[PDB]
């Protein structure tokens, strides 16, 4: 239930599933998912006073999605800082048993 999946040798269309539970709407055109995430999180920001508690978490999540050249060390440091504060939800490969431990 935590994943929405379909699979077949050739796509099977079930006639009994019915309509989906989503709504069709229009919005800004983004080249990649990272741009959309950064834009929406930036829009969430700038509406919060400087003393809000969630601001560091929002800033870290925004910096997590940024892409660039030669930012490997900074990105790893930011990821570690998010992991040690319990937001990153480690993906069960090495940081759940090293960083979290």
């Amino acid at each position: 239930v935590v994943d929405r999946q379909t699979g077949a040798v050739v796509a099977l269309n079930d006639l009994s599933v019915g309509r989906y539970d989503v709504t069709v709407d229009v919005g800004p055109s983004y080249t990649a998912r990272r741009d959309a995430t950064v834009s929406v999180l930036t829009n969430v920001l700038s509406s919060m006073l400087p003393t809000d508690p969630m601001r560091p978490a929002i800033q870290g999540i925004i910096l997590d999605n940024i892409d660039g050249e030669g930012l490997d060390d900074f990105k790893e440091y930011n990821r570690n800082q998010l992991l040690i504060s319990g937001i990153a939800k480690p993906r069960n490969e090495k940081e759940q048993q090293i960083v979290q431990q």
Partner: protein, 51 residues
């Protein structure tokens, strides 16, 4: 015209005034040049590939 058995030509002066805006556009482009950039995707190793 002949003008008493000659071929003196009409004077044809020019004052160019359509080049200023074209030069403005060209300078505006050359001030901020652009190129091709590769954006990563949703994979574990797209960052290094794009770099």
């Amino acid at each position: 015209t002949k003008l008493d058995e000659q071929f003196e030509k009409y004077p044809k002066f020019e004052i160019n005034k359509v080049a200023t805006e074209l030069n403005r556009i060209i300078a505006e482009y050359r001030n901020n040049r652009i190129t091709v950039k590769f954006r990563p995707g949703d994979r574990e190793a797209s960052e290094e590939l794009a770099n």
